[PDB]
């Protein structure tokens, strides 16, 4: 996948996290993506390897 | 929880003990019937 330059490989499915209306990504404790928002459509996501 | 899980997609592992903590406490109990 290749969200808005950040790119990454891992499985994609329906998120629950209480995300704010500004954020736009989700970090880890290691610094590493696990949720983010889509551009185009306005939902939410979890990536996991 | 979350520090375990994190571990876990990076690559870490733990492994189970071999003997399992009740086969030690049937081992006691013969280390301790032999005794009295």
Same mark, same amino acid.
């Given at each position: 996948?290749?969200?808005?330059?950040?790119?990454?490989?891992?499985?994609?499915?329906?998120?629950?996290?209480?995300?704010? $209306?500004?954020?736009?990504?989700?970090? @880890? *404790?290691?610094?590493?993506?696990?949720?983010?928002?889509? $551009?185009?459509?306005?939902?939410?996501? @979890? *990536?996991?390897? | 929880?979350?520090?375990?899980?994190?571990?876990?997609?990076?690559?870490?592992?733990?492994?189970?003990?071999?003997?399992?903590?009740?086969?030690?406490?049937?081992?006691?109990?013969?280390?301790?019937?032999?005794?009295?």
């Amino acid at each position: 996948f290749n969200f808005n330059g950040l790119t990454g490989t891992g499985v994609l499915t329906e998120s629950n996290k209480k995300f704010l $209306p500004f954020q736009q990504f989700g970090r @880890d *404790i290691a610094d590493t993506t696990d949720a983010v928002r889509d $551009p185009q459509t306005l939902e939410i996501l @979890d *990536i996991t390897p | 929880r979350d520090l375990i899980c994190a571990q876990k997609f990076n690559g870490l592992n733990v492994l189970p003990p071999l003997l399992t903590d009740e086969m030690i406490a049937q081992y006691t109990s013969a280390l301790l019937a032999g005794t009295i």
